[PDB]
């Protein structure tokens, strides 16, 4: 027994509980995402590999991508905790190959929100990856403003 | 391309491919000296066309 067995608290309380403690193993599965849309091409692994902490140690539960939420969508692309980004950045001097390990100590809670909705109030009743802005933003060719809040708390 | 336009405008660019189908036919010549002959002309007519194309 290292997981509970279901018992009642009082005579006919009608209660049954257990307890499950979780983790992620950092994965290495090298997934290069082809992007010809922007020069920067980006390899994000399969977004950690979720595991259960029993006995003090991780025993896998498989791809943590489809498990966990949220992930940023680099044109859809699921980037979340427990990955590595191998980065090919460009400049007028040429290019450099950098690497940034994507940690959950790099997770960063940022919402991007509309001009007319508050920055620090999110929208859970609007879809997670979408909200339809209904406000008019007029563009003028010397003042081309796409106004949003990049809420960097 | 999977432009999965759900909540996300997800732009994937999945390449796929196709190999054409070509046929190759070989012909060989030998004699009574058991040595393979060089210089022999052999002519393949495509005779499934209803003439000697």
């Amino acid at each position: 027994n290292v997981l509970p067995t279901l018992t009642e608290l009082a005579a006919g309380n009608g209660t049954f509980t257990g307890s499950l403690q979780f983790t992620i193993v950092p994965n290495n599965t090298v997934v290069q995402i082809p992007s010809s849309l922007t020069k920067t091409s980006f390899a994000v692994y399969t977004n950690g590999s979720l595991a259960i902490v029993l006995n003090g140690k991780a025993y896998s539960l498989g791809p943590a991508g489809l498990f966990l939420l949220p992930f940023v969508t680099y044109t859809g692309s699921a980037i979340g905790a427990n990955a590595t980004a191998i980065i090919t950045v460009s400049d007028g001097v040429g290019t450099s190959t950098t690497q940034v390990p994507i940690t959950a100590e790099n997770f960063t809670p940022i919402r991007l929100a509309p001009f007319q909705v508050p920055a620090q109030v999110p929208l859970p009743n609007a879809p997670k990856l979408k909200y339809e802005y209904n406000g008019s933003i007029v563009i003028t060719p010397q003042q081309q403003v796409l106004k949003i809040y990049v809420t960097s708390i | 391309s999977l432009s999965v336009q759900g909540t996300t405008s997800e732009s994937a660019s999945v390449n796929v491919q196709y190999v054409p189908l070509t046929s190759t036919i070989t012909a060989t010549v030998v004699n009574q000296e058991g040595s393979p002959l060089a210089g022999a002309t052999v002519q393949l007519y495509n005779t499934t066309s209803g003439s000697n194309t």
Binding site: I33, S35, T46, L66, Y74, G76 | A12, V14, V16, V19
Partner: peptide, 29 residues
């Protein structure tokens, strides 16, 4: 399975070659 630009492609994964009369099936998460 492989996360190409958000679509968890079980099929197609890039550079997948086909044959005369072969059925592509689009299996995607």
């Amino acid at each position: 399975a492989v996360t190409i630009n958000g679509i968890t492609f079980y099929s197609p994964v890039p550079n997948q070659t086909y044959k005369y009369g072969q059925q592509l099936v689009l299996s995607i998460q």
